[PDB]
């Protein structure tokens, strides 16, 4: 005799699985009691989450709208059609010149599918070097020749770097390297670069060496949509992105691609038109993915509707203004940030002049409910000892914080780095001894409690703090 | 301007007010799911509790790495959730954690397989899997007669399929053995998407050992049956087991990669005390090689599903799923229809339409119009992709709504009426699709069939949400 | 002061390097005092050798005739043009429908340049399996997965086999495999298959799977020229060959390719023409080789004139008659030759029914001045101890031997195998045991003396036995 | 009824193939009636040519000495062993620390074999850029992405360049690129570079990036053997070469490789030993080649003996002294050479200050019997046409010319570029117009005549001018 449907299938999580329910409630408390500075994180809306947790998860819908492998997709099709056109609308794309696939599971799936569509195995790729602020998915291999990214396993990658004096992209060295290496794909976009991108110059380089030009705008997609960042669609053939960072949506990826007539070309036929659409669609499916995750797609459609509002543009401006205010506060205390400013959502803090390592700061901060991450500095490609931390404004800005609140965050960070110096002063620059100061430290306990009282006092999108299990 | 919208406005308001359009479409899709007869073998209806974990604050957290070795901080509770997910995974599948580990981060099934391949093979290494017209899946490799590489498994690796016996419809182990002796795959893959019989993993191991291949089972379709001990256990013979979690296992949409650990079994010419080293390679392929941040809301939801799957009640359901497939299969054979291998031992029925003079897509498109959802499926010999010769029918989703054998025989009668209407249209308008499409318009028997079907479907419970609360009643 | 030009540069080899001169004189004696049965070996002519050793070795001539990177190639061009046109004439090709590149240094370079011209790295290739009579350059990899041939390193090979019962190529199994595997290149030809090739059935299979069809005719190239073997040019897109085997020329390779209008197809523009010429030329140079070896090409031109004579056709007939006579003799003594006969220049002999492996017979033969080589047979997996030996007729036929002489060769071979059996019976199959019988063996000594006395009575092309150092 | 062996097999070339015989006599005359300045060409000895044109061509000998696949190799082994040990001797290698494979058919086969032995497909390689003086086989792809060398087809290559101002290899740019690219194999050596190489710095660079270090010493093979150039063996893991350039032997290649204990390196186990020998042998055969060309190997053993003499060392000194006397002659006349001198066998002439291209000069020089080749200068690749020519001394030095003769060659080159400019004044730079001056030009007639009388006044190794057909 089967267990009735209402029992296993309709009972709430709290009764079905108190263990997981309790863990989610502890994670809910952690999120609204911490100062969350990881540049790639955000707090998405309850409306997004309600679509994310929905019966859309049940449906297999392989194919694309209007061309499915099987049936039952009448409404899945409307949702995905709406998600795609809301995506082109959010990024101000003429749909006769731009298409988009919203099925990639995440950002790395979106990048690898773009590479699969446009390149053969072992074709050459160039992206921003990791210690210059690039991302793993743009290619990464070690000095010992170990290939870390699958981008470097199945293709041939070579990084370009920032100028080590200024911290800006050395466009001359990029152009020199691309002319020698002759990449078939040139990637722009990054993860820890604190300035905006000159896509026009990337298009000029791309045209000189004959490469396709792809922008991965994942970190700044929210800024791009809000027209608070330079527009990569003006110059790139293909644009990839995540949807969960500054865009403030679910965890998913998108691939945008040109359609229609190609611009004037050196000796190639009149009337030539782009042929990305079919290649990109086929790489996503059937080549790489299986059934799309329709709960992410519907949730993304909600996110994209929310992004295309006057309010979201205000949020994007505030994100930048908050990043700037935090950076100015740290520089006024004597700290040094990379390029002495920011033009986007993040700040790169150089910790070498303090004699501290990104590891120690990240460790201490985490024990004080401040989450950031360590990060290489000024392109210093050496080892496992990052000399900086990366700080981002999207998540706390989403909780309603403005400049003076981010100045308070700067003062919290100042107390943390002061605490870190003092712990290194007493126990030394070796981590296993530094750790002894991290336990039963009343000063740390005081800072952590002041951090949590600060964070507790702001609203939280996505759920109701008044209803959460752990308010204390 | 320069003042942000209040958090309560954009961030806490419910979906029905924030996005009436999307809310309305999800409610239409909710009604569709509980008013049709859902026979797509890879689908299921998961619990509300799984869905509550899936739509949760876990979506906000970046946690690259694994429990106990993250890149970032703040992962105290994500670590407890993922560790719980792994150990419930090993429990549900009866693995000794000293001999088996599991990575639960794959985004879906195809990511799980490509990660397993990346972990164990170099680019262009040889792979063999079950041919699609024999019941296999794309992710095990697929290229066309023209030489077109369809699956990324065939783009980045060198695949060669194996087939069922031309006559019996069972895996042809001798031909398999012969091909692998010649082709010499580095990885031999078992499991499939439309094969109606259980698998002999002991024979696959013998062949794998004979040729020197790693043996991997993709148990996606039968995951719930294996966990329930209602199917042969691949963990007893395979090096690596991959799976989805949203099919018969009835979880969220995700993948898992199981791998052996510890001392290797005695093989000749093998150094004594030899140990498996799948664990580091598989973890590394998932991250940092292939994926980015894990989707923690899926992982937490998977943990819920793995708890639910490891119950006595879930074993009853798996037994019923197999009993419902058989009941439907016997019902269709007793009407004169041709079922592949004349029965089933798992969750699905493979129906051969070629003796009827019918193509799988015709029956698929007519059923869809009557709220019967299935899929056309290649049967042995097929060459087409738009127009294969059969349909594949599964029991898990309608069984999860509480249907038993008698209800599945009513489904069989609905399937008979639909095929008869399909032949009626063909007899009247022609065998060409453009002719055929004329019968699907203003068709009274088709309207009648669609009404009976939804009347039927409406009579059962629905997991995952409350019908008593839906927009469309 | 510099050594005068005449001193180092015009003095004979006997004075400049007596050590090497003496070694070549010892090798000249070996060649006319032994029974030479290596099926890939021949005795080329003095004329070929006078061109091979000439001032042509001095000239760099990268490019093709009329399109060289360097100047001064007026006469290299005429020679290479002469060689190409004589190549087409020898194999009966209309130059409007076939072209040829004569620059490959040897056979293996010819094959790799053909693959490089026609395929991308990792494309699929099918070739005759080695234990079915195939060659390494058509692909070889071990059961353990060791990639042995470059063909298997840079491309993806899968072998096709002979039918177990008949010893003939199994065209049904081939078609089945090619349909599954989907090769882009299907290769025919071999080095130990004793029968001829049905190129029409191969073309039917290649069309069925969408493969290019290449024939490697190296072994039977002299028989093809003479129209004593089926003609691969009737059905193949590309034909590769060596020139030093049955063609009786210098050591070189050639790549023949179709030109001009294509036959009717589908998706092919009406009026389409073959596109092999430029890819093949380019793959040979600049992709793979450097400067051509012009002395080889001039010597090859001479050989190609000598092959296109009525005399060469008599030789090719005799080569085939001698092989049949040898195989018939061995079969009458109870020996198992594969397919129980031959249609070409060689005989393949399964020794496993005798309880022997081919390395034992090859070693004992060698000590008796009989040169052949061990050879895999159907089912073998051993590098060092295959189950057969391969024997071919071109070289000793070139010395004038006819059927009667090859029946005596059979009796020597039968004597050699009986002695191998005696030794094995007495000492064992273990190598260090079998060796115990290879020394102080009076029966061995006698067989060697008989063999060399038989061998010295016949003429020898390439040099004058009357003027050689060791008689 | 076979044709008698003596008619086809022992008759001389002149009566068997008068066409080919005549063309070789024309090419013999051409070789001594002009000024051969192709840096990669030489005139080898009659002794080498006699071994090259010998009965060694008849033998199949797959394998290596003492480890052959079949029989008849008693004297082939002695010859190949002698070639290998003379090779190690000529380049001053301790045989406990160095081995050599002498079977590569030429230089490009040697290089591709070395790569196959040392690297997996698609592994990264760096070599000297072609416009910077490198060679195709070290990698070459076009600005469009077309892969030209098989090196770039089957591996991933990235070139390094000379300094565009000074013409010297930019070693700091190379280190920068190697650190970014991380090649598994770093190649040194080139085809048109007028300076010696800093192998110690290449070793420092290879060790910094974890690369293998190979030298392709083809052009300077003779200078290194004669100890007239830096020794790559002190620093490189592998040395490949041809044998027909400054080494003055037959056309063939060699691969040297280290053996025995490795020197200390951090991260290296104590007692670690080199593992090149089996890999390199296996790549050559059975992976890439078939039968060795034993006539080349025999001819090579001769050339290696001739190279390890006091006479040959005087020749290598004279080669460098002649290249220096030519370079200092041109600089004395206002002309400019890259790096303003040379340390080896060649000069690189910058023609751009004259407003000339290397194409105009190479073609006018051919029309009056001076063979040189156009060449890019200062690593320029954007240039429509090459801005210089390359001139080598080994070939005419082998004819006995000393410094004063190469000064006379300098005057002939001055006349050539003057007469080239004469034509450019009166027809411009468009080659369709420039071609108009290359016909019915009396001044070019006088130059062709003076050059031909000049060349005829010297001896010729390899054959006897007194006995040639065309005098
Ligand atoms: C991904 N896949 C499986 C598959 C399954 N269901 C589908 N369903 C639909 N509606 N469309 C598909 N492309 C489809 N494809 C494919 C894709 C292409 C071919 C294909 O090329 N078929 C050729 C035959 C192969 C050839 O001639 O090269 C044909 O004629 O249909 C087959 C299967
Ligand atoms: C190239 N080739 C054919 C071949 C023919 N004649 C030869 N002759 C000699 N003297 N040596 C050889 N290696 C040799 N090889 C080879 C090479 C390697 C193997 C091999 O690697 N291994 C096994 C077979 C074991 C396996 O199936 O992998 C052996 O012992 O022969 C087989 C054949
Ligand atoms: C054996 C096997 N392995 C892997 C997958 C991939 O699952 P995914 O869609 O989550 O990527 C599938 C999907 N199978 C689905 C979609 O093709 C089906 O309807 O059969 C599968 O059958
Ligand atoms: C530019 C870019 N492209 C792609 C990705 C991958 O997104 P995914 O986690 O969804 O795979 C990232 C993630 N970036 C995260 C994790 O590394 C970060 O903290 O910076 C990215 O920055
Ligand atoms: C360094 C190097 N390595 C290899 C080779 C090729 O030798 P090969 O022609 O015997 O193949 C050359 C030939 N170089 C000739 C033809 O390009 C030349 O005129 O320079 C070379 O310079
Ligand atoms: C069909 C075929 N194609 C190519 C080759 C290679 O010729 P090569 O030695 O000149 O490389 C051979 C060599 N065959 C020789 C050496 O293995 C033999 O004894 O059979 C061949 O048989």
Residue numbers in the entry:
A (entry chain B): 0 to 471
B (entry chain A): -2 to 470
C (entry chain D), D (entry chain C): 0 to 470
Copy text from the publication.
Serine hydroxymethyltransferase (SHMT) reversibly interconverts serine and tetrahydrofolate (THF) into glycine and 5,10-methylene-THF (5,10-meTHF). Next, we have obtained high resolution crystal structures of AtSHMT2 complexed with MTX and PTX, as well as of AtSHMT4-MTX complex. For clarity, in this work we divide THF, MTX, and PTX molecules into three moieties: (i) pteridine or its mimic (P-moiety); (ii) benzoyl (B-moiety); and (iii) glutamate (E-moiety).
